[PDB]
Amino acid sequence: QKSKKTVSKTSGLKEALSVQGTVIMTSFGKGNMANLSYKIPSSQKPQNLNSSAGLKNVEVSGKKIKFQGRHPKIATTDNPLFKPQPGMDLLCLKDKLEMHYFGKTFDDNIHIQLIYQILDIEKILAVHVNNIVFTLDNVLHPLDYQTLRGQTNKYDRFKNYIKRKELLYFGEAFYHENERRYEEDIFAILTLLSALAQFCFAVNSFWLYQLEDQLSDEFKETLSILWEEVTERIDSEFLKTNTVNLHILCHVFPKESKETIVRAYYEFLIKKSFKNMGFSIKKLREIMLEQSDLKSFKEDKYNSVRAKLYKLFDFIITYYYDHHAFEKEALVSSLRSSLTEENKEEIYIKTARTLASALGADFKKAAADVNAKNIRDYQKKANDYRISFEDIKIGNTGIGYFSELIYMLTLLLDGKEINDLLTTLINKFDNIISFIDILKKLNLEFKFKPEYADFFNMTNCRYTLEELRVINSIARMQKPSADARKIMYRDALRILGMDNRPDEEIDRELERTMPVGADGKFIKGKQGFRNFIASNVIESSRFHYLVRYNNPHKTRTLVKNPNVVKFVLEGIPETQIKRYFDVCKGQEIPPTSDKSAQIDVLARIISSVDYKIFEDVPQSAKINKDDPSRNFSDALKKQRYQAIVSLYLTVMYLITKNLVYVNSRYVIAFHCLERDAFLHGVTLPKMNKKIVYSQLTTHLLTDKNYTTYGHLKNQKGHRKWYVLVKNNLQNSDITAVSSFANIVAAISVVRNSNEYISGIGELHSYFELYHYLVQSMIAKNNWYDTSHQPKTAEYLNNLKKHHTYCKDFVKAYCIPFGYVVPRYKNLTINELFDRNNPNPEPKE
RNA sequence: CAACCCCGUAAAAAUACGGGGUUCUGAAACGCCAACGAACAUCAUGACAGC
Ligand SMILES: [Mg+2]
């Protein structure tokens, strides 16, 4: 196998640019900035030098550039000017894109790389907006301000929809404290969501890039309050909340003033600045804890205090490098100039070992002050600090309109999805700034078209990148606690049995098990079961995910097919299977060592789960996680019940989550197809009120330019994918392709998955499960036309006979993506679909 | 694991073999951050209580 971590990239080279006949070589800088190193000019080719940089001994040999870095070794790279067309992309849209964004064609390859980073900023945003729209459409079943009341029809639907009580399932989007927001704020949020949704599918075409002159004076007011809400909560009473951590830190560092520690802690914790530095801090800490002198904090005595312990340890590492500017730089360069992946691990081990000896004593001093007695003492004297530090607070700084829109989106997403959106955006913006820096340094054109000029400039992009980092930290924090209500209790009992039964029956069982007095107040005596449900099924992140993306009425079908359950359990490692088996075993099961024996018992336990088993829980008992030998008969029974429920919810959560992941990767393909058709000048026709998505692949199969410098090449020696796409184009249904597009847009695989998951034969990947469900929907609903294509009958017979999807049918309805071969191969071959599960391609 | 370009020995095929490049190919350049991922996550020790 070949890795993109090549010799040239290791030796120091970052980029190789072509400008007006000369070639320019750059090198790595501070963070992501690039500095100029060498220039080879035209004709004479003296191999000119620009700065010391890191490159040395650059020469030209044939069509190759031969250079050398700081280490003694020879690196070889290819001259960018010795190509059939310099800087041209495989999709043949360089000039069109440059004219669309800048207004004139350029003789270089710097601008098109910048344009693709902008093109990548819209795929992930479209994915997440589609997910959010589906979530709101699923949980709640189906002009500016004044006209809506005058309509008398939209007002009668908005007043009732806003009246729905399922809005609690989104944490802070619609509910503050324990009361509903004003109507106009909800209206503003919904209108903004609709506008972004209609923008991201490709309102004016420049809406997102100029919002100051296209937002009314009432939408700006709403976005400001939501940002001011979270900032005032954290900025105020910051000293009172974090008294324990500040007292310990000032004890470890006695020679430092109180003001310095307070400011340093604010940067480490609120606006995290220790993450994007160059080396991992979490990974360094893990290796230090495996040393002989420090392998005690891994024991069970520190289970109750482990989140607080690890925060203190990380701050000590960050503070050590914030004062040693020489050792920090050496570590980054060592990691950036490594040969293989095994070499990186050796560097981390050496650094981790030498740190444990240097600052291991400070680790123990902090760990001797984290216990029950000391923590309570500190909390009493919480008003002994008086520090201003008002300048660096996040509340005393304005924020842009683009960043405020992102925060509003974060109010409707969970922890993992916030990471995916913000991480991708940060990377794209960092790359854009570097390209503008190189262009401005070389005296080339850097001004965008007037429409894009306000947003796409270096002065604004730096501000946006700084704001996006804070939003990631502040929007993932735990929201304030809220009181559970009757609606949530109904859904909790509807998962553990009680599927599709009248609300009166659920209400009667609520009265019998959770007593309510004659005055509408709970009885103080017996409330064990209610606390068990609230603390294990209502306050779990998995339960929220199941309600948003699935239906509690029909969610029990996923654990009735042994093939589906056994596929999920087989992926869990052996160590975690043993712990599940031990706690959840029972009393009449012999102890076994084989893995397959353990899966069989666990599979049966998940299948038979009812709420009546948990009706007698010793909720009043206390479980000791520090010394597991002090637990007794009543305590151990409680552990079994909360372990079973966690396994029950986890299996459903994993199946639902992975089906959404596969679906979103098909939204990207359809989003790109509409974008590319407009640029290439090809319109998508209509026939019998359908959309022929296969028009672009037919048009580009008979184009002279695309068949010479394109993905689909028709020449002697490179005529492989031209034939296959042409052959597969003859085996397609217009109805089948159109039906597939509607399935992906509405995410109907996840929603209608209770009617077709009971008959799957054998599973080996999530790819097979997704396509089995798709091909079952087409067969039952008669979404095909055998008259126009006599081959769709053969595919359906293969599916019904073998109880598994057909490989030749996935190539029929995924053909409108054939003009891009890498995307077509990835989405039609199981081996190449998943990045984390690579397998050899099956030749046949 | 697949794509594209350059360079070598056979050769006119859906060309095979052996080397090197690629932010201008696909969720996809290097070093952080993320994801796979299930024992979690998180400005606030843990548990009970309160809803
Ligand atoms: Mg790219």
Side-chain angles (χ1 to χ4, degrees), chain A residues 229-249:
Chain A
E229 219 172 355
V230 64
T231 55
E232 182 65 26
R233 190 212 302 163
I234 296 170
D235 266 19
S236 292
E237 63 255 11
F238 170 84
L239 294 173
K240 184 260 290 181
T241 301
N242 291 264
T243 46
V244 189
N245 274 9
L246 286 166
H247 281 88
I248 296 164
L249 283 183

PDB file of all heavy atoms in Angstrom, chain A residues 229-249:
ATOM      1  N   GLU A 229     -27.366  35.692  25.932  1.00  0.00           N
ATOM      2  CA  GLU A 229     -27.896  34.801  26.956  1.00  0.00           C
ATOM      3  C   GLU A 229     -26.809  33.894  27.523  1.00  0.00           C
ATOM      4  O   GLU A 229     -26.621  33.806  28.740  1.00  0.00           O
ATOM      5  CB  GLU A 229     -29.027  33.973  26.350  1.00  0.00           C
ATOM      6  CG  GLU A 229     -30.217  33.724  27.242  1.00  0.00           C
ATOM      7  CD  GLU A 229     -31.346  33.061  26.481  1.00  0.00           C
ATOM      8  OE1 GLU A 229     -31.212  32.900  25.249  1.00  0.00           O
ATOM      9  OE2 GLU A 229     -32.364  32.700  27.100  1.00  0.00           O
ATOM     10  N   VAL A 230     -26.084  33.204  26.642  1.00  0.00           N
ATOM     11  CA  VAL A 230     -25.095  32.231  27.092  1.00  0.00           C
ATOM     12  C   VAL A 230     -23.861  32.928  27.656  1.00  0.00           C
ATOM     13  O   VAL A 230     -23.237  32.436  28.604  1.00  0.00           O
ATOM     14  CB  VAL A 230     -24.743  31.261  25.946  1.00  0.00           C
ATOM     15  CG1 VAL A 230     -24.069  31.989  24.797  1.00  0.00           C
ATOM     16  CG2 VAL A 230     -23.869  30.131  26.454  1.00  0.00           C
ATOM     17  N   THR A 231     -23.484  34.076  27.088  1.00  0.00           N
ATOM     18  CA  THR A 231     -22.282  34.764  27.550  1.00  0.00           C
ATOM     19  C   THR A 231     -22.450  35.298  28.966  1.00  0.00           C
ATOM     20  O   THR A 231     -21.538  35.183  29.792  1.00  0.00           O
ATOM     21  CB  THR A 231     -21.919  35.897  26.593  1.00  0.00           C
ATOM     22  OG1 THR A 231     -23.037  36.779  26.445  1.00  0.00           O
ATOM     23  CG2 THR A 231     -21.528  35.343  25.239  1.00  0.00           C
ATOM     24  N   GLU A 232     -23.611  35.886  29.269  1.00  0.00           N
ATOM     25  CA  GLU A 232     -23.835  36.435  30.601  1.00  0.00           C
ATOM     26  C   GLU A 232     -23.876  35.342  31.662  1.00  0.00           C
ATOM     27  O   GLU A 232     -23.461  35.571  32.803  1.00  0.00           O
ATOM     28  CB  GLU A 232     -25.130  37.246  30.618  1.00  0.00           C
ATOM     29  CG  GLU A 232     -25.447  37.906  31.949  1.00  0.00           C
ATOM     30  CD  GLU A 232     -24.434  38.968  32.335  1.00  0.00           C
ATOM     31  OE1 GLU A 232     -23.794  39.542  31.429  1.00  0.00           O
ATOM     32  OE2 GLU A 232     -24.277  39.228  33.547  1.00  0.00           O
ATOM     33  N   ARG A 233     -24.366  34.155  31.305  1.00  0.00           N
ATOM     34  CA  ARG A 233     -24.415  33.049  32.255  1.00  0.00           C
ATOM     35  C   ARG A 233     -23.018  32.603  32.668  1.00  0.00           C
ATOM     36  O   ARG A 233     -22.778  32.293  33.840  1.00  0.00           O
ATOM     37  CB  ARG A 233     -25.194  31.885  31.646  1.00  0.00           C
ATOM     38  CG  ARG A 233     -25.513  30.766  32.610  1.00  0.00           C
ATOM     39  CD  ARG A 233     -25.543  29.434  31.889  1.00  0.00           C
ATOM     40  NE  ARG A 233     -26.514  29.435  30.803  1.00  0.00           N
ATOM     41  CZ  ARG A 233     -26.538  28.549  29.818  1.00  0.00           C
ATOM     42  NH1 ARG A 233     -25.654  27.569  29.747  1.00  0.00           N
ATOM     43  NH2 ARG A 233     -27.474  28.650  28.879  1.00  0.00           N
ATOM     44  N   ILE A 234     -22.083  32.560  31.720  1.00  0.00           N
ATOM     45  CA  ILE A 234     -20.752  32.041  32.012  1.00  0.00           C
ATOM     46  C   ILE A 234     -19.824  33.147  32.500  1.00  0.00           C
ATOM     47  O   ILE A 234     -19.049  32.945  33.442  1.00  0.00           O
ATOM     48  CB  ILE A 234     -20.186  31.325  30.773  1.00  0.00           C
ATOM     49  CG1 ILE A 234     -21.045  30.110  30.429  1.00  0.00           C
ATOM     50  CG2 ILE A 234     -18.751  30.905  31.007  1.00  0.00           C
ATOM     51  CD1 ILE A 234     -20.714  29.493  29.106  1.00  0.00           C
ATOM     52  N   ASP A 235     -19.880  34.326  31.877  1.00  0.00           N
ATOM     53  CA  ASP A 235     -18.976  35.408  32.256  1.00  0.00           C
ATOM     54  C   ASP A 235     -19.234  35.871  33.684  1.00  0.00           C
ATOM     55  O   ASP A 235     -18.296  36.064  34.463  1.00  0.00           O
ATOM     56  CB  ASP A 235     -19.112  36.574  31.279  1.00  0.00           C
ATOM     57  CG  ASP A 235     -18.104  36.509  30.152  1.00  0.00           C
ATOM     58  OD1 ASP A 235     -17.553  35.415  29.911  1.00  0.00           O
ATOM     59  OD2 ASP A 235     -17.864  37.549  29.507  1.00  0.00           O
ATOM     60  N   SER A 236     -20.500  36.059  34.043  1.00  0.00           N
ATOM     61  CA  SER A 236     -20.835  36.371  35.421  1.00  0.00           C
ATOM     62  C   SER A 236     -20.630  35.141  36.297  1.00  0.00           C
ATOM     63  O   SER A 236     -20.644  34.001  35.824  1.00  0.00           O
ATOM     64  CB  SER A 236     -22.276  36.862  35.530  1.00  0.00           C
ATOM     65  OG  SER A 236     -22.431  38.121  34.901  1.00  0.00           O
ATOM     66  N   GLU A 237     -20.430  35.394  37.592  1.00  0.00           N
ATOM     67  CA  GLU A 237     -20.137  34.382  38.607  1.00  0.00           C
ATOM     68  C   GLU A 237     -19.166  33.316  38.109  1.00  0.00           C
ATOM     69  O   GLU A 237     -19.336  32.127  38.394  1.00  0.00           O
ATOM     70  CB  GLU A 237     -21.432  33.742  39.135  1.00  0.00           C
ATOM     71  CG  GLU A 237     -22.278  32.957  38.138  1.00  0.00           C
ATOM     72  CD  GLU A 237     -23.518  33.713  37.701  1.00  0.00           C
ATOM     73  OE1 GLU A 237     -23.619  34.918  38.010  1.00  0.00           O
ATOM     74  OE2 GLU A 237     -24.390  33.101  37.049  1.00  0.00           O
ATOM     75  N   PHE A 238     -18.132  33.735  37.374  1.00  0.00           N
ATOM     76  CA  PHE A 238     -17.076  32.804  36.992  1.00  0.00           C
ATOM     77  C   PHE A 238     -16.175  32.486  38.175  1.00  0.00           C
ATOM     78  O   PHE A 238     -15.744  31.341  38.346  1.00  0.00           O
ATOM     79  CB  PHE A 238     -16.255  33.377  35.837  1.00  0.00           C
ATOM     80  CG  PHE A 238     -15.002  32.600  35.534  1.00  0.00           C
ATOM     81  CD1 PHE A 238     -15.044  31.488  34.717  1.00  0.00           C
ATOM     82  CD2 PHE A 238     -13.781  32.991  36.053  1.00  0.00           C
ATOM     83  CE1 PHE A 238     -13.898  30.778  34.434  1.00  0.00           C
ATOM     84  CE2 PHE A 238     -12.633  32.281  35.773  1.00  0.00           C
ATOM     85  CZ  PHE A 238     -12.693  31.175  34.964  1.00  0.00           C
ATOM     86  N   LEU A 239     -15.874  33.490  39.000  1.00  0.00           N
ATOM     87  CA  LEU A 239     -15.006  33.269  40.148  1.00  0.00           C
ATOM     88  C   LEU A 239     -15.672  32.394  41.199  1.00  0.00           C
ATOM     89  O   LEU A 239     -14.991  31.609  41.867  1.00  0.00           O
ATOM     90  CB  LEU A 239     -14.594  34.608  40.757  1.00  0.00           C
ATOM     91  CG  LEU A 239     -13.705  35.503  39.895  1.00  0.00           C
ATOM     92  CD1 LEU A 239     -13.513  36.857  40.549  1.00  0.00           C
ATOM     93  CD2 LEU A 239     -12.364  34.839  39.647  1.00  0.00           C
ATOM     94  N   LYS A 240     -16.991  32.508  41.358  1.00  0.00           N
ATOM     95  CA  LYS A 240     -17.684  31.735  42.382  1.00  0.00           C
ATOM     96  C   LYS A 240     -17.788  30.263  41.999  1.00  0.00           C
ATOM     97  O   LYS A 240     -17.676  29.383  42.860  1.00  0.00           O
ATOM     98  CB  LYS A 240     -19.070  32.331  42.631  1.00  0.00           C
ATOM     99  CG  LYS A 240     -19.855  31.675  43.756  1.00  0.00           C
ATOM    100  CD  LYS A 240     -20.889  30.694  43.223  1.00  0.00           C
ATOM    101  CE  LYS A 240     -22.029  31.419  42.525  1.00  0.00           C
ATOM    102  NZ  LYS A 240     -23.057  30.472  42.011  1.00  0.00           N
ATOM    103  N   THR A 241     -17.999  29.974  40.713  1.00  0.00           N
ATOM    104  CA  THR A 241     -18.199  28.593  40.285  1.00  0.00           C
ATOM    105  C   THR A 241     -16.911  27.780  40.367  1.00  0.00           C
ATOM    106  O   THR A 241     -16.934  26.613  40.776  1.00  0.00           O
ATOM    107  CB  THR A 241     -18.755  28.565  38.863  1.00  0.00           C
ATOM    108  OG1 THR A 241     -20.001  29.269  38.822  1.00  0.00           O
ATOM    109  CG2 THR A 241     -18.976  27.136  38.400  1.00  0.00           C
ATOM    110  N   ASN A 242     -15.780  28.377  39.999  1.00  0.00           N
ATOM    111  CA  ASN A 242     -14.511  27.659  39.879  1.00  0.00           C
ATOM    112  C   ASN A 242     -13.578  27.921  41.055  1.00  0.00           C
ATOM    113  O   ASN A 242     -12.363  28.025  40.874  1.00  0.00           O
ATOM    114  CB  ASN A 242     -13.825  28.027  38.569  1.00  0.00           C
ATOM    115  CG  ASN A 242     -14.554  27.494  37.358  1.00  0.00           C
ATOM    116  OD1 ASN A 242     -14.225  26.430  36.839  1.00  0.00           O
ATOM    117  ND2 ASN A 242     -15.546  28.236  36.891  1.00  0.00           N
ATOM    118  N   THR A 243     -14.115  28.038  42.271  1.00  0.00           N
ATOM    119  CA  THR A 243     -13.266  28.304  43.429  1.00  0.00           C
ATOM    120  C   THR A 243     -12.346  27.129  43.733  1.00  0.00           C
ATOM    121  O   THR A 243     -11.181  27.328  44.097  1.00  0.00           O
ATOM    122  CB  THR A 243     -14.122  28.626  44.651  1.00  0.00           C
ATOM    123  OG1 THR A 243     -15.185  27.672  44.758  1.00  0.00           O
ATOM    124  CG2 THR A 243     -14.708  30.015  44.537  1.00  0.00           C
ATOM    125  N   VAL A 244     -12.850  25.902  43.603  1.00  0.00           N
ATOM    126  CA  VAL A 244     -12.069  24.731  43.988  1.00  0.00           C
ATOM    127  C   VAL A 244     -10.842  24.585  43.099  1.00  0.00           C
ATOM    128  O   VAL A 244      -9.735  24.323  43.582  1.00  0.00           O
ATOM    129  CB  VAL A 244     -12.946  23.468  43.952  1.00  0.00           C
ATOM    130  CG1 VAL A 244     -12.201  22.295  44.555  1.00  0.00           C
ATOM    131  CG2 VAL A 244     -14.245  23.710  44.692  1.00  0.00           C
ATOM    132  N   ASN A 245     -11.016  24.750  41.787  1.00  0.00           N
ATOM    133  CA  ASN A 245      -9.898  24.558  40.871  1.00  0.00           C
ATOM    134  C   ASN A 245      -8.863  25.668  41.011  1.00  0.00           C
ATOM    135  O   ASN A 245      -7.660  25.422  40.869  1.00  0.00           O
ATOM    136  CB  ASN A 245     -10.408  24.469  39.433  1.00  0.00           C
ATOM    137  CG  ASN A 245     -10.816  23.060  39.048  1.00  0.00           C
ATOM    138  OD1 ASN A 245     -10.875  22.169  39.891  1.00  0.00           O
ATOM    139  ND2 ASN A 245     -11.097  22.853  37.770  1.00  0.00           N
ATOM    140  N   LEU A 246      -9.307  26.896  41.286  1.00  0.00           N
ATOM    141  CA  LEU A 246      -8.366  28.007  41.399  1.00  0.00           C
ATOM    142  C   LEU A 246      -7.548  27.923  42.682  1.00  0.00           C
ATOM    143  O   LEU A 246      -6.357  28.260  42.687  1.00  0.00           O
ATOM    144  CB  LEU A 246      -9.108  29.339  41.320  1.00  0.00           C
ATOM    145  CG  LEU A 246      -9.599  29.735  39.928  1.00  0.00           C
ATOM    146  CD1 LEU A 246     -10.596  30.868  40.012  1.00  0.00           C
ATOM    147  CD2 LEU A 246      -8.423  30.125  39.058  1.00  0.00           C
ATOM    148  N   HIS A 247      -8.164  27.490  43.782  1.00  0.00           N
ATOM    149  CA  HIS A 247      -7.428  27.358  45.037  1.00  0.00           C
ATOM    150  C   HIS A 247      -6.330  26.307  44.926  1.00  0.00           C
ATOM    151  O   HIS A 247      -5.213  26.507  45.415  1.00  0.00           O
ATOM    152  CB  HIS A 247      -8.384  27.018  46.178  1.00  0.00           C
ATOM    153  CG  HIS A 247      -9.144  28.196  46.703  1.00  0.00           C
ATOM    154  ND1 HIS A 247     -10.346  28.606  46.172  1.00  0.00           N
ATOM    155  CD2 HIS A 247      -8.872  29.047  47.720  1.00  0.00           C
ATOM    156  CE1 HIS A 247     -10.782  29.662  46.836  1.00  0.00           C
ATOM    157  NE2 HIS A 247      -9.906  29.949  47.781  1.00  0.00           N
ATOM    158  N   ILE A 248      -6.634  25.175  44.291  1.00  0.00           N
ATOM    159  CA  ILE A 248      -5.638  24.120  44.132  1.00  0.00           C
ATOM    160  C   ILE A 248      -4.492  24.597  43.251  1.00  0.00           C
ATOM    161  O   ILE A 248      -3.316  24.350  43.546  1.00  0.00           O
ATOM    162  CB  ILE A 248      -6.296  22.848  43.569  1.00  0.00           C
ATOM    163  CG1 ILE A 248      -7.320  22.301  44.558  1.00  0.00           C
ATOM    164  CG2 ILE A 248      -5.249  21.796  43.261  1.00  0.00           C
ATOM    165  CD1 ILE A 248      -8.277  21.314  43.953  1.00  0.00           C
ATOM    166  N   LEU A 249      -4.814  25.288  42.156  1.00  0.00           N
ATOM    167  CA  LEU A 249      -3.780  25.737  41.227  1.00  0.00           C
ATOM    168  C   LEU A 249      -2.856  26.765  41.868  1.00  0.00           C
ATOM    169  O   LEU A 249      -1.640  26.732  41.651  1.00  0.00           O
ATOM    170  CB  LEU A 249      -4.423  26.296  39.961  1.00  0.00           C
ATOM    171  CG  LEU A 249      -4.944  25.234  38.992  1.00  0.00           C
ATOM    172  CD1 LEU A 249      -5.505  25.875  37.741  1.00  0.00           C
ATOM    173  CD2 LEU A 249      -3.850  24.247  38.642  1.00  0.00           C
TER     174      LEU A 249
END
